[PDB]
Design a protein that fits this description.
- There is one protein chain.
- With 203 residues, this protein is mainly β.
- The chain has 2 domains: 1-102, Acid Proteases (Cathepsin D, subunit A, domain 1, Beta Barrel), CATH 2.40.70; 103-203, Cathepsin D, subunit A, domain 1.
- It contains 2 helices and 18 strands.
- The radius of gyration is 17 Å and the shape is globular.
């Protein structure tokens, strides 16, 4: 299907014979699901996100059906805030990011979807993250007024400054909206701006 980004791209998945809801997340390398039992052997791993690191169980070669498309691959199980399908399985189901409904650039998900953006007169690299509601940019001396905010992901919450009506050009496409500024490990373009550039998921 083709999925737009006005709402979270939540889908039903089948894993270990059970149904779960999960977010299609182009900003995730891996697939992470809330605590559950999976048949098979696992190994301990740590993974990170906006707020720090969590401990997970890594299960390899697990069949997962994602809105009716089959994948077989690595699933990490642990205390993630949201079940997420990451690039390791998005690539298996042939999911791509597409601008302006397919008229614009197509971005495959074999590697992190990093693009050039312009904000505040500065050029930066940022990750297109369908699993992010908001856009979070590395510490940058943006002029203007702001309001404090906390935002969360794997690892917990960070404090940021919320600026409104900030122009952001993404891969040459103009957008304007809310930007959150703080100590994010990677600059993230979230759905609030991805929708403005007509970005969709397709598979």
């Amino acid at each position: 299907p083709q999925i737009t980004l006005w709402k979270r791209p939540l889908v039903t998945i089948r894993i270990g014979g059970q149904l779960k809801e999960a977010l299609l997340d182009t900003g995730a390398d891996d697939t992470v699901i809330e605590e559950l039992n999976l048949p098979g052997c696992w190994k301990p791993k740590l993974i990170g996100g906006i707020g720090g690191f969590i401990k997970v169980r890594q299960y390899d070669q697990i069949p997962v059906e994602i809105a009716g498309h089959k994948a077989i691959g690595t699933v990490l199980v642990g205390p993630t805030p949201v079940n997420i399908i990451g690039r390791n399985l998005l690539t298996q189901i042939g999911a791509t990011l597409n601008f302006c409904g397919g008229g614009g650039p197509q971005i495959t998900l074999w590697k992190r979807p990093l693009v050039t953006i312009r904000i505040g007169g500065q050029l930066k690299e940022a990750l297109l993250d369908t699993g992010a509601d908001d856009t979070v940019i590395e510490e940058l001396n943006l002029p203007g007024c702001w309001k404090p905010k906390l935002i969360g992901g794997i690892x917990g919450f960070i404090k940021v400054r919320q600026y409104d009506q900030i122009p952001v050009e993404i891969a040459g496409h103009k957008a304007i909206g809310t930007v959150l500024v703080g100590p994010t490990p990677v600059n993230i373009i979230g759905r609030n701006l991805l929708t403005q550039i007509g970005a969709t998921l397709n598979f």
